[PDB]
Design a protein around this motif. Structure first.
Motif, short mmCIF file in Angstrom:
data_model
loop_
_atom_site.label_atom_id
_atom_site.label_comp_id
_atom_site.label_asym_id
_atom_site.label_seq_id
_atom_site.Cartn_x
_atom_site.Cartn_y
_atom_site.Cartn_z
N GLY A 2 93.66 3.78 54.86
CA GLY A 2 95.00 3.28 55.09
C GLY A 2 95.10 1.78 54.88
N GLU A 3 94.07 1.04 55.29
CA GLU A 3 94.08 -0.39 54.98
C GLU A 3 93.83 -0.65 53.50
OE1 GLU A 3 92.17 0.70 57.56
OE2 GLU A 3 93.20 -0.06 59.33
N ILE A 4 93.08 0.22 52.82
CA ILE A 4 92.87 0.05 51.39
C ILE A 4 94.19 0.16 50.63
CG2 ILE A 4 91.78 1.01 49.34
CD1 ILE A 4 89.45 1.86 51.26
N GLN A 5 94.96 1.22 50.89
CA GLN A 5 96.20 1.40 50.14
C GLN A 5 97.35 0.58 50.71
OE1 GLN A 5 94.66 4.64 51.07
NE2 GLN A 5 93.54 4.71 49.12
N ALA A 6 97.34 0.30 52.01
CA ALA A 6 98.44 -0.44 52.62
C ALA A 6 98.55 -1.84 52.02
CB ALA A 6 98.25 -0.52 54.13
N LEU A 7 97.42 -2.49 51.79
CA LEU A 7 97.39 -3.80 51.15
C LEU A 7 97.25 -3.69 49.64
CD1 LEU A 7 95.05 -5.60 53.72
CD2 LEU A 7 97.55 -5.48 53.69
N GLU A 8 97.27 -2.48 49.09
CA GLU A 8 97.17 -2.24 47.65
C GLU A 8 96.16 -3.19 47.02
OE1 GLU A 8 100.03 -2.84 49.22
OE2 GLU A 8 100.96 -4.67 48.44
N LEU A 9 94.94 -3.17 47.56
CA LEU A 9 93.94 -4.16 47.19
C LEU A 9 93.63 -4.16 45.70
CD1 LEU A 9 91.64 -3.66 50.30
CD2 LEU A 9 93.47 -5.33 49.98
#
Length: 48
Positions: A2-9
């Motif tokens: 969720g942090e990977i896609q939430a910040l669209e790294l």
């Protein structure tokens, strides 16, 4: 995940890379033309 896609790294990285590429190209092109002579330095030195 969720942090990977939430910040669209990956997308952030790609967009920042392309932005930096454009800025670097523009600044590099400008800097070479920006350079000037130093004759006025000698003129002012003589005047003083």
């Amino acid at each position: 995940n969720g942090e990977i896609q939430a910040l669209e790294l990956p997308q952030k990285a790609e967009a920042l890379k392309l932005f930096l590429e454009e800025t670097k190209a523009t600044v590099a092109v400008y800097l070479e033309s920006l350079q000037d002579t130093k004759i006025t330095l000698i003129i002012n030195w003589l005047q003083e």
